A paper describes a structure:
Phytochromes (Phys) are a divergent cohort of bili-proteins that detect light through reversible interconversion between dark-adapted Pr and photoactivated Pfr states. Here, we present models of both states for a dimeric Phy with histidine kinase (HK) activity from the proteobacterium Pseudomonas syringae, which were built from high-resolution cryo-EM maps (2.8–3.4-Å) of the photosensory module (PSM) and its following signaling (S) helix together with lower resolution maps for the downstream output region augmented by RoseTTAFold and AlphaFold structural predictions. Pr/Pfr comparisons show that bilin phototransformation alters PSM architecture culminating in a scissoring motion of the paired S-helices linking the PSMs to the HK bidomains that ends in reorientation of the paired catalytic ATPase modules relative to the phosphoacceptor histidines. This action apparently primes autophosphorylation enroute to phosphotransfer to the cognate DNA-binding response regulator AlgB which drives quorum-sensing behavior through transient association with the photoreceptor.
We then defined by cryo-EM a 3D model of the full-length PsBphP1 dimer as Pfr by analyzing red light-irradiated samples. Here, 4,796,622 particle images were extracted and winnowed down to 1,029,141 after 2D classification, which revealed three similar but distinct EM density maps representing unique structural conformations of the photoactivated photoreceptor. Two maps resolved to 3.1- and 3.0-Å were dimeric head-to-head arrangements of the PSM with only short S-helix extensions visible beyond the PHY domains. The PAS-GAF regions were intimately connected in the dimer like those in Pr while the paired PHY domains were either moderately or strongly splayed (designated “medial” and “splayed”, respectively). Both the BV and hairpin conformations matched previous views of Phys as Pfr14,15,22,25. Much like the high-resolution Pr EM density map, these two Pfr maps lacked the HK bidomains and much of the S-helices presumably due to high mobility. Importantly, the PSM regions of all three maps (DoD, medial, and splayed) allowed unambiguous modeling of both protomers as Pfr as judged by sufficiently resolved ZZEssa conformations of the bilins that aligned well for all three maps except for slightly different tilts of the D rings and by the presence of obvious α-helical hairpins, which are both signatures of this spectral state. The Pfr maps presented an even more complicated picture where the three divergent conformational states seen here (DoD, medial, and splayed) implied that the S-helices become more pliable and possibly even allow dissociation of the HK bidomains as inferred by the conformation of the “splayed” Pfr model. Although the data for the DoD form provided structural appreciations for positioning of the HK bidomains, similar data for the splayed and medial forms of Pfr were absent, suggesting that the HK bidomain positioning is highly dynamic in these states.
Author numbering:
A (entry chain A): 2 to 122, 135 to 341, 344 to 449, 465 to 512
B (entry chain B): 2 to 120, 134 to 449, 465 to 514
Write the structure that this text describes.
Amino acid sequence: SQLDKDAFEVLLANCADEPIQFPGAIQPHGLLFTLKEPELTILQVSANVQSVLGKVPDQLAGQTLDCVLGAGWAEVIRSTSANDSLVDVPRLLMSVEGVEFEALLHRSQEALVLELEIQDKNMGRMLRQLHAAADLQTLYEVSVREIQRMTGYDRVLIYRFEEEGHGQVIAEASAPAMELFNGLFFPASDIPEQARELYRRNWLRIIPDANYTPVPLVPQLRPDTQQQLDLSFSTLRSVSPIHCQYMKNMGVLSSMSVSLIQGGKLWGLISCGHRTPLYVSHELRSACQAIGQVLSLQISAMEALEVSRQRETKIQTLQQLHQMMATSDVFDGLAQQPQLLMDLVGATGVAIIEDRQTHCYGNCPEPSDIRALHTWMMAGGEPVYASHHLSSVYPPGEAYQTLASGVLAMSLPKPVDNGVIWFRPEVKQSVQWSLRLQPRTSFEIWKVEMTGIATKWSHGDVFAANDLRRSALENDLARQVS
Amino acid sequence: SQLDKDAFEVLLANCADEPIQFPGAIQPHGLLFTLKEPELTILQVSANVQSVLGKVPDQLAGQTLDCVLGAGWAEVIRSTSANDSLVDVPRLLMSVEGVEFEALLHRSQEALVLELEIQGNMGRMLRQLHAAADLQTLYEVSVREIQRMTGYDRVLIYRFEEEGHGQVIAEASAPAMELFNGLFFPASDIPEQARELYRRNWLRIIPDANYTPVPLVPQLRPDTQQQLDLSFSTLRSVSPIHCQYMKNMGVLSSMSVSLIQGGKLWGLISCGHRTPLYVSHELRSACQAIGQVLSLQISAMEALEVSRQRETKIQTLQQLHQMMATSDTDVFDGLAQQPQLLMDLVGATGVAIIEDRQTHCYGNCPEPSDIRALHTWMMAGGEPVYASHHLSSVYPPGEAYQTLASGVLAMSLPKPVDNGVIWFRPEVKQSVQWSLRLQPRTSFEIWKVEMTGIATKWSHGDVFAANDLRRSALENDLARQVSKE
Ligand SMILES: *C/C=C1/C(=C/c2[nH]c(/C=C3[NH+]=C(/C=C4/NC(=O)C(C=C)=C4C)C(C)=C\3CCC(=O)O)c(CCC(=O)O)c2C)NC(=O)[C@H]1C
Ligand SMILES: *C/C=C1/C(=C/c2[nH]c(/C=C3[NH+]=C(/C=C4/NC(=O)C(C=C)=C4C)C(C)=C\3CCC(=O)O)c(CCC(=O)O)c2C)NC(=O)[C@H]1C
């Protein structure tokens, strides 16, 4: 299939900005209808419907639901929709030719979009177990454990989305015969922003098969709209061939994703993976969604504990810090307890510039390196830095990324010989793991993507730094007087 | 007749300090065994064993479980208890002489206390709770679906104010039955030991009201004093005071899900049922999970609530700045040109702007000559803020406006001719409107005297908002101080 292969290549030419909200195709495990709500007249119908219902989608276009779905059920659908907002609709189940379809209704472009998903013919204790978790890591462990336990899926993962966008596999429950994924990082380019919008606006994305031929959805433009059909809010969609082949080369044939949402933001993704195709029942579909609606609230509540404790120990930090500031230069005294400065931000590497021998601690490059690094701090004038990239401001400084890649540095406003640099290395060294569209390849792409880019600094973490400079800006006048 | 009444009257005198952490008795719907940790020798046994099992309870002390629980089941619970810390324990169902007991194990004072209790929609429920947009709507759906699953007639949710009093914020009453929405009862209605036991655990269950507690024998702890710690035990005697309280209501079965915002008792979901009924283990955990989930939502959504107020408060202060700047005669009198905006800045009902003998009042406040003394009494201390939960408690002659002006907060710059931006609040007696010995009416009536002259509490943000205006008033006057040119 040479003619198919090169035609697939042109798809890979552009993927960051590709129309995926309006593919014009749906997965073959259901039916799709686009109607005018008051009369329930068909505007769009997929080509899958030929294999289950009347002849051709074009003839059904422009007609009423009373023909395709028969009588009685049409009036039932009209009664259920009525004038309701279509929020928290009860469970519906239809049977047009002995096949049971779950009917999910929503409204797009003032049109009734109805998805007939084909369906083939404990919880409190687990919530208590989630509540019993004392830290975030144990929470992740128990959540993935029970999800893999009851979902029945061979592989269950969870990614957390950093502010930079490169997802991190923070936990897993992999069964034997799949590779481990703890600490794996994949670039944000692996998920287009349109797919991110689709994930955030929904709560559950299911792809039961990654080896399928998308079915046409004709007419591609609505007769009364002359524009593409919004399929964002439909479970029955078309999977892009690029991520389809990604799944094929990832070993995953059936996948799920529970979009963990915190305050309108996509905190992460409870993902799955299964070589044998599996069709998920709605009862378990809601339970997994109920996990995300609870766990994301539980996670945000638990980091709300963590962000309080970390901020709390930051508050105490300057309390014991300032006692040694008052004991005896101001930036000279902080070097006698280097581990106390580490916990203020989580630097994993610190150094204090003083006189000539810049007394570094933890891990740190040679003095010939840090000396030619802090010069790009005080010329700008900013007392603090949020430097994921080491060499964004200092181009030829790529020789420090072995140890020094994230520079949130402070100093006294003294123009000469001051500073206490908190080096966070590249995330590449922190996590050790292990053709085209491979998890191995995206790891390699991430290595170039992460090259020189370090771990993100929290706003409070920079604030907690600013207090240390402010605390050092308190007793200096007392030090000057004394 | 009089003999029973004689005992109760002595009990009613010392309810505020009564030992309910060590009742010495258990409810008749199960058994309790306190054992030595390594050998499982019966250290304490309830008197109900002569009925549940038939063996005398006076004896059997200091002997292994083999007499009652056999050897195989004793070994099973030995394996379950040992090296587990009892953090997460699966369901243990035992069958002694054809009777099924659900086993709950814990440890108090280094002894194994074992309690033998005689024996799809969750996803939609969680989705419905998460879909709530407002706190009142959240309460309504919570109580309505709790009444939908649990067969208990009345379902209420009390939100405990920081003062200590409980109010029924939402209620799902059965048709043709008493209505308690908007009710208030005092803090003394629930003792501090009871509140500690509520916050320590998650559920309190009283299957039957008119019940005779069955005591423990031997009563005194064989090891040390302080008796048996029945604080983490689901099976525990109910004090006759609250017992007759429930009996008067007509409700004989009572559920109670302790809503905990971390380590604080935010409130209680109470299911009152007029007919005795059971709970079942599956429903017991589902109700507990609802309280754990709902308290997560309240804690999360309350943060949404205050942030909305914080955004509204911050925006108003900059909004008031534009109004304040346009004034040409008096900064605070100019602030009175938009009084309805001033009311909602801090949260209040009456607002008074005080000029020289001209109290530019707006809303519900006394006539100027009465709160004049309150304005001068502020000058007695010169406090930047005067957040007062109770007015008559601090200001003696507060009865002249105790009905309407009880919760007072104000602020003013130090000036020769002082002003006021007093933010009154009516006593919550006026806000509440609801229809002999232990009744909600007398509880409401005893609450009315208890909460006489006390309005709702001022939050930290409310007190903070007054300072921001005072900073703005200082800053606006600071610009006014230079604009004499
Ligand atoms: C610019 C185009 C690209 C792309 C397209 C694409 N990706 C997704 C969604 C992905 N891709 C994931 C990639 C992974 N990274 C890993 O480390 C692993 C496995 C260990 C995988 C699979 C990924 C996790 C997602 C989210 C799915 C989930 O369930 O978590 C989409 C959206 C597909 C859809 O139809 O929803 C598209 C179109 N693939 C590329 O390789 C880049 C170039
Ligand atoms: C000083 C002692 C007293 C006391 C003791 C007591 N009360 C409780 C628990 C109660 N009592 C409640 C009473 C109500 N007040 C109302 O307004 C209504 C109804 C509208 C009721 C029922 C009440 C709500 C609780 C908390 C129950 C819950 O929902 O969690 C106890 C604890 C008993 C136990 O075993 O749990 C005690 C000891 N009652 C008094 O009236 C005063 C004198």
